[PDB]
Symmetry: C2
Subunit: 490 residues, 2 copies
């Protein structure tokens, strides 16, 4: 009878899903939109194609579900983070979106890093880098003819993609704590735009949205858009939303997203924890309570499997990796550190390059496939062990297409000595935004009810003894050391 | 009108070739024979199987050539070195041969080396090793029923495979200086059996062949064997024969044989030079003068291309390696140290294993092929640079199947900054034995005539400046560092 609609506005695709209270999908839609690459290292989206893709996703999902718009109890919104937009009082872009992947501001933030880096890290949980919204917003109103003067009294709204979508759906100009936290203009311990950061990036207050909790009615949709006046009541950044959708509701519950690269986040609850090797960020603001997180990422995980397929071409499909790797009882001394663009935490070596080591006459395709799957697990452990210094790790909940690889998921549990939990619902980003929106209109009673209803497809239990974990991991660290500094030699 | 028959009795096949004055081939025969491995690490040949293969090869070579037995002016003999045989007065073997590959005697050699290791190196030019004949002959004496007793009287003949063939051929019991020098019983500087070593290894003098020049009539075949009485008049170990067949008649001329592994020999003329990284051996003895050599080997050169083909299955044929590698202008930072069973000279690290390094998302089959061919050239340079510390290197003359690879041979020249000379005749081992035999019956007037007749198919000329050369080889050394010690980690 009644359902929650989730919008997951991802970086290459917009998705829409209709869920019931048992997290069954009744309809879904998904449309790709163009990735604009105007100069080298530059990444842009056209907000009108994001919008058209999203709105068609919605229509497909409603059609597939065979519901009327008035059966939609609420809408949650979740989104590619950091990506920075600007628009008219009428909701019309004053420029393309500058995507989180875009490096145009690399040197702008390089300069301020020596002077203001540690202050930026304390206020925000973030290491200054072009990734985040501040430099990008500044770039727009310093290079866009007219923008700064249009901003200088109040004709310009800034937003992250959530904020752009919410404005277009409801008329309101809002963001949630988790999206806000990724702007590098938001003070995370106070829960407010930081005035010093605004002055550093020459940002006029008038463009800023109002910052709200992640679960709350922000506004209602116009009838002429969706056919009903639906409350829009859920907002979080995508990775935070996936962490919610995984029901990672307690401190120490980790969620790892496996893709081209990886994004890993751990719930720290009310603790605001700081690491030299991790981002500190906001998970969500729920019923007056802010939950925090620690975040680590890896550029190359699944891409190492794409390299097996496209570079040396020893497989036709990523999935063949599993059959090859399970022909072996161990790695037989063969490791692969796929440091195609360096090493990140905890080694931080831009000059490291990929290495395969332990090759003998008997080394086969099997060894390379297994070394590649092991490497994804080892890199994951590298991040999780940094988190573990600050918060006890309970378990790993996982999403992304590579989580269908049973070998990788088992080895991941084994090497962490932690359970790995794979959800029945694969679209955890969407499901999280659905949970946040639904809680705000009592579609679910509270988070304990959500957690009681939540269903695992499969639980991978750790089966590897300490001696074995520590010998395998030791191999990994030794291989990593042999990858370091290679591009200085060459 | 007349020709020279050369027998090249190799490790896995016996070969026979009829040559003329111009080193043209007129007849060839070739027969594989069984490798016998009675235990792991143990390696034997049946002498009757060798003999039967060698005799059929001769008859095919003679048939092939359309000649009468008395058109054969002389026979030269060359052979797998070290391999140790024993037989009785009517040519009957009293056991299988123990092959140079056989490790059965490794234990026996290991305790001998602690005490006597250093006088063996000064007497012979050899580091004690199960490789050489001494220990294998001890083993026969101490394990074959009633052999020591028969050898206490003068009833038992020992020798290397040349000595065997020459005895069945002519009834004489002889070897030359080059083969004798590989027994580890023969004093290199004194040119006689060393009495200490015969006692160390408990050899009855009675068993020893007479040691001759490499070019002199030892005897004559039986009319009933080949159909005429033919002088047998040339003998040298296969690698020494190849050096001769490459016309490497002056100090500093190197022969690299490229196979699954490599043997590399430089002529050092009268000079007896000693290295911690190379064997000192005898090249040949000719017109009352003995020439010396330095020898290095590498376990894995061509086997790394076989690994591309049969381990990782990235090529179908060894030759595709040429075209892959010339797709690239450089290695682009990708190195492959194929240290499958460790590093030999000058690193001497049994725990090193294979490394591929410099991998990025754009690393392709082309990078792996090129890095493998570069490795074979870098490894060769590692050995040749050890030779340059004791003798000036003039040029490299090459043989073996991989010398057909123009990319490898050009790169080999470039990295050494030396000319690489590929001969017209590929059968350099047999050719050398043919030259030694023909010199004894004036088929050729002297080594100057052979030198003046000798023909290169291609001379590869260095085209790489010094700065490029040292940058590329620096890369190699850095990749080798990172290969080291790996089997102590896993």
């Amino acid at each position: 009878e009644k359902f929650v609609l989730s919008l997951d506005e991802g970086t290459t695709s917009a998705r829409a899903i209709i869920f019931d209270r048992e997290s069954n999908i009744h309809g879904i839609g998904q449309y790709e939109f163009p990735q604009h690459y105007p100069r080298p290292g530059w990444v842009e989206h056209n907000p009108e194609e994001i919008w058209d893709a999203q709105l068609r996703a919605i229509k497909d999902a409603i059609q597939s579900a065979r519901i009327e718009p008035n059966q939609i109890a609420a809408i949650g919104v979740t989104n590619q983070r950091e990506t920075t937009l600007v628009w008219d009082k009428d909701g019309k872009p004053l420029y393309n979106a500058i995507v989180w992947q875009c490096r145009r501001t690399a040197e702008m933030v390089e300069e301020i890093k020596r002077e203001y880096g540690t202050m930026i890290k304390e206020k925000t949980g973030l290491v200054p880098d072009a990734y985040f919204s501040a430099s990008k917003l500044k770039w727009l109103l310093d290079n866009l003819p007219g923008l700064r003067e249009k901003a200088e009294k109040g004709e310009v709204m800034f937003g992250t993609v959530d904020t752009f979508l919410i404005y277009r759906l409801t008329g309101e100009h809002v963001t949630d704590y988790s999206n806000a936290s990724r702007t590098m203009l938001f003070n995370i311990k106070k829960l407010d735009w930081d005035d010093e950061l605004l002055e550093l990036f020459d940002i006029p207050e008038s463009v800023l949205p109002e910052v709200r909790e992640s679960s709350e009615v922000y506004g209602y949709t116009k009838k002429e858009l969706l056919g009903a006046e639906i409350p829009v009541s859920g907002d979080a950044g995508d990775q935070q939303a996936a962490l919610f959708g995984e029901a990672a509701f307690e401190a120490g519950m980790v969620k790892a997203t496996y893709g081209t690269g990886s994004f890993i986040l751990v719930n720290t609850d009310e603790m605001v924890l700081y690491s030299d090797n991790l981002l500190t960020t906001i998970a969500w603001g729920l019923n007056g309570r802010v939950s925090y997180a620690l975040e680590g990422s890896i550029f190359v995980t699944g891409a190492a499997v794409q390299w097996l397929r496209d570079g040396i071409k020893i497989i036709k499909h990523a999935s063949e990796t599993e059959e090859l790797a399970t022909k072996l009882e161990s790695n037989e001394g063969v490791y692969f550190v796929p440091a195609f663009v360096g090493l990140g935490a905890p080694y931080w070596d831009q000059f490291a390059r990929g290495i395969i080591i332990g090759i003998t006459r008997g080394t086969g395709r099997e060894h390379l496939a297994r070394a590649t799957l092991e490497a994804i697990a080892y890199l994951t452990r590298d991040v999780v062990d940094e988190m573990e210094k600050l918060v006890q790790i309970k378990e790993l909940r996982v999403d992304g297409g590579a989580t269908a690889n049973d070998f990788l998921m088992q080895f991941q549990a084994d090497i962490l000595n932690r359970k790995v939990i794979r959800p029945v619902v694969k679209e955890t980003t969407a499901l999280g935004a659905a949970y946040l929106a639904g809680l705000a209109v009592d579609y679910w009673a509270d988070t304990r009810e959500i957690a009681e209803l939540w269903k695992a497809e499969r639980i991978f239990e750790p089966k590897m003894d300490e001696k074995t974990r520590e010998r395998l991991y030791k191999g990994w660290k030794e291989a990593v050391k042999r990858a370091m500094g290679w591009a200085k030699v060459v």
